[PDB]
Homo-oligomer: 216 residues x 2
Amino acid sequence: DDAAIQQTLAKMGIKSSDIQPAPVAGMKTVLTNSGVLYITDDGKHIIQGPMYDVSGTAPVNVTNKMLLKQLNALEKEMIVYKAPQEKHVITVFTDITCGYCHKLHEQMADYNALGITVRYLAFPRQGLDSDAEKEMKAIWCAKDKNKAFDDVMAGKSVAPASCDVDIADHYALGVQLGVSGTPAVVLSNGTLVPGYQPPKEMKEFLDEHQKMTSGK
Amino acid sequence: DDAAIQQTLAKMGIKSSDIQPAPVAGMKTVLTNSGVLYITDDGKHIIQGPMYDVSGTAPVNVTNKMLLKQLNALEKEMIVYKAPQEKHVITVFTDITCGYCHKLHEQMADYNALGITVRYLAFPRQGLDSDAEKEMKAIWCAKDKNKAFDDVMAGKSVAPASCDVDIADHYALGVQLGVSGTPAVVLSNGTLVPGYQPPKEMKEFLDEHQKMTSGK
């Protein structure tokens, strides 16, 4: 009962954003501002987690899966720079005021040339309500997100814009995932790898990760 | 059933120390060498604790409540400073190399005078491989634990020694209960309250905790 669950969280000052049936009978997976919790249908018991499914081809972290579900929903808000012939797809939490982020963007042609598609989500290191957050809100709301990001990173000024994109979601999700600096990379399998890597190195890293992830 | 849970734990190379009931249908409270886990009766899902009962006034850590069993099993290994007119009994995870722990101990007579009995368990912040662990191992192995603890704190040379006392167990239990620093107080109901509190404040805290946890 979603209603009972929200009342309990309310009494505790905890706010939820997503509730799903858990793989465990009588329980639900609840994403909150205190992390992913596991709560019984009656809202009377909460288990910290994470929850792992140890009944299948391998140990699956349900908490990580819940967070990846949030990332999936944010695909419509990602700024995508697709490689001509896509070999790898990475999601990068970036900050327009971040030096390494400036560098990463300036080398986008190279990452793309090496078959790496880069998808951006906003992560203002200075937090919400910062100049950085305000600036990225404008970019993400532009008529052409890519051109707007390109313009700003080029030192130009983007036109103020408003839309339903909420940078707080990008920031919050990054925090929940473990982002502690920018740029931060999230691999196609869900793994978080904080830090900047040049095109050639990144390509090598991703080829190896893909091979290691596939046992090859 | 026991078999399913035992087979799952075996798959993880984990050894179960005790399978107990859980306040949630379809799962059990399992104490292992990897901490307390909640495992469904079919052994298909594992949820890291702790679990909280939030059906009442304030949240209650049911995991810590259960662990009181482990805590009481170490009763004889505790260094006890009995209050003449005992009104409250608290268990404190302390580190002889911690300044706040020294400040608390120096006022032991005051806590005792306020009706607070203090029982110590050893918690080396620096881990089992530290001077703290070696020094407290000698204290807990002394003919007179109380005098030995006082001496060490006061800067006196404690006579080296060894015994059946395993500081590792005090450390392991503390970690499980959530000890994230010293001194850390464990209430008679399992509630962990990290931090130093002067005798007067401590007494007021315990009194209010009773009322807020009771209902009068």
